[PDB]
Design an enzyme around this catalytic site. Structure first.
Site, short mmCIF file in Angstrom:
data_model
loop_
_atom_site.label_atom_id
_atom_site.label_comp_id
_atom_site.label_asym_id
_atom_site.label_seq_id
_atom_site.Cartn_x
_atom_site.Cartn_y
_atom_site.Cartn_z
N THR B 1 -22.39 7.04 55.80
CA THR B 1 -21.25 6.29 55.30
C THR B 1 -21.28 4.83 55.68
OG1 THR B 1 -19.50 7.88 54.94
CG2 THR B 1 -18.90 5.79 55.87
N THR B 2 -21.13 3.97 54.69
CA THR B 2 -21.09 2.52 54.99
C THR B 2 -19.93 1.82 54.26
OG1 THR B 2 -23.47 2.40 55.32
CG2 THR B 2 -22.29 0.34 55.24
N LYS B 33 -13.45 5.94 50.23
CA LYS B 33 -13.15 5.58 51.60
C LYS B 33 -12.38 4.28 51.79
CE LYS B 33 -17.57 7.63 52.30
NZ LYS B 33 -18.94 7.30 52.68
N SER B 141 -22.71 4.63 59.40
CA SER B 141 -24.13 4.88 59.71
C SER B 141 -25.13 3.92 59.12
CB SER B 141 -24.47 6.28 59.30
OG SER B 141 -24.47 6.38 57.90
N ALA B 180 -27.57 8.58 54.82
CA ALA B 180 -26.20 9.05 54.85
C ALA B 180 -25.27 8.19 54.01
CB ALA B 180 -25.70 9.17 56.25
#
EC number: 3.4.25.1
Lengths: 212, 224, 222, 214, 222, 214, 222, 216, 222
Positions: B1-2, B33, B141, B180
């Site tokens: 996840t970024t 998100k 990540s 990820a």
């Protein structure tokens, strides 16, 4: 009724003493018109997305109620969903609160409340207006609610000047006029239907002068 | 996840990827998100991907609850303090593995200079905040890859459009070095989500725009 | 155990297998894992017969409780939130081993487009939800096999009948590769259960209709 | 009904017995002038960064309120931020507290409060003055506030002599003169100086006070 | 990271670096660790930023709160006691890894001799305090390097300018031997922050005066 | 509400009137406390803190309760902050609040009158302070002397004519014993807050040592 | 750290060193460990210098609190009991490593024989006390060396002066054999602190008298 | 308010005039307690602590409640500090505070009158202390004797007339019994002393044969 | 440590040693472990000194408290039950290392036969009590040795003097074989303490009488 006629008496006199507020349905939603001198103390307020509040009486008492209603509405929206908070729900809870207060508190609250609801964006539903009084009695009104001060001259000046889908400029003039019958010194707000989520919008200063 | 955030002249932009993983496996392709939390703020939460909507929902309620009660919005610092307490109140559950680090993007109406009014605040495990003074920040990540990409690209940010494009490119670069983080899926038509905030408030950038941007990057890098 | 759900034009379908295991041992062959929770929703839980019927029973009570108290049903977003709260409230007990992951299928009567009004929502350990935008989803020990099957078969979904077929085939593929998921038992006459939801509401698909589709899948593979 | 009339009477008389206080807006902020014989008992105080307090009546009662307000202000500024505390907020809280006491308690508070707020450093906003009375009534006053003792005479004098952008020395004389109509020592003087970086409250006493006097 | 404090005639100076690390990774370059807590005190915290950020703000609120309530500021001893109490309160959280050790610099306006009215107080894990008689002190990962630098340079402190030089040189020496302490960054123009306190109160030393000092130290060592 | 409040005020006033008189006066040394007390074990005058003293008149069990609560308050504040952070103003304030709450909330008001006195810390110059707290929580800052219990008017008049600022210990004692005779060693209880002592100001002047100065 | 205490005819003397260590590192050179707690008592605490300072202050407050409340001081036995309770309270804290063992010296103004009215009381981890009937006692990391020195020198104690010489010599011996106890620093002019208590009360021994003794011990061994 | 506290004062004082008389007087060997008590079973006199005694008059169940609370107080204090730290002044003070609260707070006031007495510790020289605590919490320090319950004036006058400092135990017992008769037999008395000559627990009852042989 | 107790015709005697140890090191030579708890009882406690020393004190208070409240002392059975409850209330603390095992000696004034009215009661970890019909008992690290000694010498007990002599010899034997138990120190003049209880009550045995017996036991074995 040797204690009730008194507790009620005290409240009515207080309400009578106070200034006037008008709430009416128009084309773009609901319009709130109140006689308010103060720069920072407000008698008109946002409750939730599509729900508005207006009150008449002793400030500290109706601000307490305003806060409790926001507290209620925000809690309800979170537990379930926002679309699930309705004006009927808030009017109902004010009825229950005022009634209890007018039963076991030291003295009855000297207030008169108006809860108004407009339709959600792009939805078609006629505006709802509720009047909640000092004793918890709840009234449902199709066209308008008048609260505080000398109510009858204002209510009669409105019953003669009322239209179904009046413009913002037209409804504001019909209301200002009704108030005399019954910018500064005036608190004005609208629940704007065309707004996507939060209907409440305050009409202040230069923008208020410009329509009249 | 970024999740990335950057300041441009006149505002701030926040963008996040759509990937969710369980170990090696890809558990989701359409996770959102980044959420608008009030008229002038947006939060992006990394990790515990399902919970991102939930954290944003509670924070949004708190901000609005204050605004309605007091008749005015909280100061930006107040907004920061509330979010810091929410994070601090989740330290016990983070020791198990339920870690959620938020990134806050906002526009300060009260700031003296409108051009520099955009704000970016990052939070650590303990609930400690930091107002970013360097122009960009990222969490998740793939954050190191995203920050290193922005370090070479930031100089070309001059407006909202180029700020959004550096953000998409940063996200793309992150997906490139981190499994990820999901890159733009041209096959399913799923792209990163973004929020842009200036003096006129917080607005969701349309999928259309993030899409044209991604294709201009991907299709050209490829044979297309 | 495996539970699948998929969107078709005009609705959604949810189906689940009938097995129950105690390690390697088959402890049940008749278990109902998919329940109609209100007029427009259904929940499937991957697990034991009770933790599937007790969760669905409580959620059904919660939904109807709101409807009676307020006069109108909860919004779909509201229905999701209530389920998320129920799952989050079982996080303390889920650290022991008592994990229950639900899958929610529904029809949003208030949606703009009736064709895409079907909804599928999945939940994770923490009580986090995700509204699925891909068309299908599955939970349970055979979910990866069922999802990989639907990935190849979803293009054949055009209506309720084809959707139900893909659902039953996905569940068949799940049982073929996962011993914890039960395939159709032609000997005892036990088949997966299913619920179909469209604008007319949630309906339990009759056993005879699934049996016909099961036989067709079997005959198509030999 | 007729008993809530007596409660109103007890408090008013008490306020009348006590020494008068004046609060007025000037060029550099807000000025507080009180008649105080006492050396350690203060009727004027700091509440928060830009918010001041002044009271009249029974000491133990308004000091209780002064403390509660500081308690309130410090807690709010810590939960949100410093800039989130306003005079309106404190005036509002006092009104609510005063009303509860007026109704729930045996004896009402024989007090009259003034909450004042000036603008933040380098900001442009007109000073705000709030009067909160024994029953919880709150009023917003544009120029000056008079509490305790014989208010009409003091108020009339001020009304006649008030100047909106008056100098600190000018405003001090206008106030001391208006206070003499209701009859560097026995005087408590303080300002909310809008020109200070953060803490606006500043006491004026002794030599500094004297120069101001002349 | 490192924080230094030293007494100079008529005052006290406290300075801190700007680095923040997540293991080996530089996570921050502009961190401010020294804050003016009241008119005559300043605090510098080493350890966990989350703990550090909170401590200064809370302590400041505490000192001001007392002052407004009682009409007078707390004695220097009281200020120490309050800080010490806050630190002990955080002990349960310090066993986990959330360790925050503050360094307090102040000017005692009620001291006999105005020349030696500067005060430096350090705190240990347990919440125990100590007032320095040696003239200087440091906390953080580079504290030993900084204290050993000041041991050789303190004889040169004659006033606020020379004390600020020694303070900035001590921090330079800390960064030279400790990778967790940031040295002055010429390229980005980021320099250590400082606070100087004398009879006229606490004041933030401007970035430009610190910068001149850093260049001088750099030129002196080339 | 009124006759009720007058009745409680009357019970208190009469109980104080029935008690023995106490006098507190400032002197060059510090503060001098002289009380009419036949008992040898039951004390009307006491130490509160380093520089703060206490004197009371009225019903013993009630003022001893207040004396203990004050020592309790002082020791806790000194420990939570620092010793020099405890003042006579702080203790007078807390007695005002306690007595005031008792006056309205409790079944019977306290038949007491209190005096809290403070002296300067060693090596410092600050005029002593004397506070008088009444049954209803009213607090009065007095600059020279305080008279409590019994027939205060006669005692006070004698002092007023008699009293001189910065008098000698012997002169002050005689001026006090003489003023006490106007309202009515074995009988007396004497003590001082000696500003000369390094930390604990309170001292009792007893037996043989008192006979000299008498 | 080492604290010693010994009875002489007509009183008692208590003395303590000035070192503080963080492992092997000398963290303090001016630490006061012995404090007058009331007119006739003094406490010396060894261990964590942090649990030390706040021990004497709290005990002093408790003793004074009783006297103001009741009009008379506590009996010496009463003073011991209150101190023992304080130690017992901290036992849980001790299990972590925050061990603070106090040594109490006093003069019982109500004792029959004024010559033997000096009192020394020691405390163990559990909060247990013991009144020293042997004439001397010591606590801390150098207590064994100090007790063994006093065993040989105690016969030379005839008055306050010879008693203080033996206490300072005991501390010298403690520092000679234990790196955690600080010896007299002639360079910085830092010496052990001491309190002497007799029928006239507890008084801090002036630095000059201890310095005189320290130099005499150093010349005597040189 | 006033009328009410006067009525509570009257109830308590009448309930005390109804009660049997008790006398407490200082002598050579300590303090002597003599009460008129027909009953073998119920005691008006009791031990509180090492050197402290108790005597009461009035409603039994009410003063026994107080006797118990004092022992409870004394034992707790002696344990929290030390035995030599419990004094008669301390106990009298706590009874004053308790009676005062009961007088003000409770539905009915206690119809009791208490005496707390203290003698010196073994081998110590200090004059005996006698305290009288009344129904309203008033506390008085008496130097020679205390008389409680019944017709106190006649008893007190007799004592005033015949009191001698440091009188013999036989002498003091006759002076007291003589005094009690003025206001009103082994079977009819409850006698006890706080013997300053005992090592720790001073309180000692003088009963039966020993008592009789002493009544002469 | 060791504590012994034995019945003789017409009473009971209890005696204990004066030693204290911290591991190997000798921490005390003057420790008294036997205390008169009421007119007819005495307790000796073996275990940690802190709980034991306090222990006699709490018990003495409970017994006296009942006596003042009820007018009559507790029956011997009652005295036992109260001690048993006290010990049971310390079981949670005994798992850490704070084990306190008491031995109770008493004279039952309400017993039929005055010759055998002596009573010895021992307690175990759980708070369980036992009455010894054997006539002798011991607790502590030297108890096995003392009990064996008593078994050989109990026949020689005919009155209080011989009973006391055996008790002292048993303690001598305990010290001879156990380093944690202290024998009679003739150099310092420190001897075991003892309490003797008969129909006339509990009285501390004087030091000189025990010294005469200790010297005779030493002469007898030399």
């Amino acid at each position: 009724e040797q204690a009730m006629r008194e507790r009620s008496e005290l409240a009515r006199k207080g309400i009578a003493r106070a200034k006037s507020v008008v709430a009416l349905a128009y084309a773009g939603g609901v319009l709130f018109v109140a006689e308010n001198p103060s720069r920072s103390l407000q008698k008109i307020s946002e409750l939730y997305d599509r729900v508005g509040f207006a009150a008449a009486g002793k400030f500290n008492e109706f601000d307490n109620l305003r806060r409790g209603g926001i507290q209620f509405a925000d809690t309800r929206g979170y537990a379930y969903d926002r679309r699930d908070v309705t004006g009927r729900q808030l009017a109902n809870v004010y009825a229950q609160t005022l009634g209890t207060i007018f039963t076991e508190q030291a003295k009855p609250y000297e207030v008169e409340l108006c809860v108004a609801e407009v339709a959600h964006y792009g939805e078609t539903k006629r505006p709802e207006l509720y009047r909640i009084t000092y004793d918890g009695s709840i009234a449902d009104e199709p066209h308008f609610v008048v609260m505080g001060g000398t109510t009858e001259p204002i209510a009669n000046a409105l019953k003669e000047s009322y239209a179904e889908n009046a413009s913002l400029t037209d409804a504001l003039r019909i209301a200002v006029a009704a108030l005399r019958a019954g910018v500064a010194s005036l608190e004005v707000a609208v629940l704007d239907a065309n707004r996507p989520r939060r209907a409440f919008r305050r009409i202040t200063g230069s923008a208020l002068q410009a329509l009249l | 996840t970024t999740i990335v955030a950057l300041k441009y002249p006149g505002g701030v932009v926040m963008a996040g990827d759509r990937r969710s993983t369980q170990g090696n496996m890809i558990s989701g392709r359409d996770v959102r998100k980044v959420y608008i939390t009030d008229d002038y703020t947006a939060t992006g939460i990394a990790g515990t991907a399902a919970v991102a909507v939930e954290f944003a929902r509670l924070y949004a309620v708190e901000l609005e609850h204050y605004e309605k009660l007091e008749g005015v919005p909280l100061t930006f610092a107040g907004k920061i303090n509330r979010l810091a307490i929410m994070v601090r109140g989740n330290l016990a559950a983070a020791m198990q593995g339920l870690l959620a680090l938020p990134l806050l993007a906002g526009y300060d109406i009260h700031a003296s200079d409108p051009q520099s009014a955009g704000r970016i605040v990052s939070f650590d495990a303990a609930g400690g905040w930091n107002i970013e003074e360097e122009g960009y920040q990222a969490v998740g990540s793939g954050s190191l890859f995203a920050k290193s990409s922005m370090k070479k690209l930031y100089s070309q940010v001059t407006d909202g459009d180029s700020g959004l494009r550096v953000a998409v490119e940063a996200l793309y670069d992150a997906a490139d070095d981190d499994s990820a983080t999901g890159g733009p899926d041209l096959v399913r038509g799923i792209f990163p989500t973004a929020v842009i905030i200036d003096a006129d408030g917080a607005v969701d950038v349309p999928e259309s725009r993030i899409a044209e941007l991604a294709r201009a990057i991907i299709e050209s890098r490829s044979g297309a």
